[PDB]
Amino acid sequence: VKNKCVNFNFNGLTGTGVLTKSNKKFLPFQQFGRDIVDTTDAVRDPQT
Amino acid sequence: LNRADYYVGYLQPRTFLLKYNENGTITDAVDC
């Protein structure tokens, strides 16, 4: 479910955040996405 | 079998600085 504040537990990454569609360019071997200040930014859905 | 290769190198613990493109490709690296 998207477009709502939802408690996620993606593959062991517990947290609370709004989830939506994005236009990243995740390469085939990539799973996580982080920033310069090292915060988990974009997560490739394991079953999507 | 048949009827300009073998470039072997050893790795060591080094700090590297890598430049990531806007697409996640590693376009450059500089040793430290």
Binding site: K25, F26, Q31, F32 | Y7, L18, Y20, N21, G24, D28
Partner: peptide
């Protein structure tokens, strides 16, 4: 057989350390 000539690596031999997508 083989030879043991020596060359330079230059800017070479660099793989992705972890699996984190990164941009800019």
């Amino acid at each position: 057989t083989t030879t043991q000539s020596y060359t330079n690596s230059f800017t070479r031999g660099v793989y992705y350390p972890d699996k984190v997508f990164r941009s800019s």
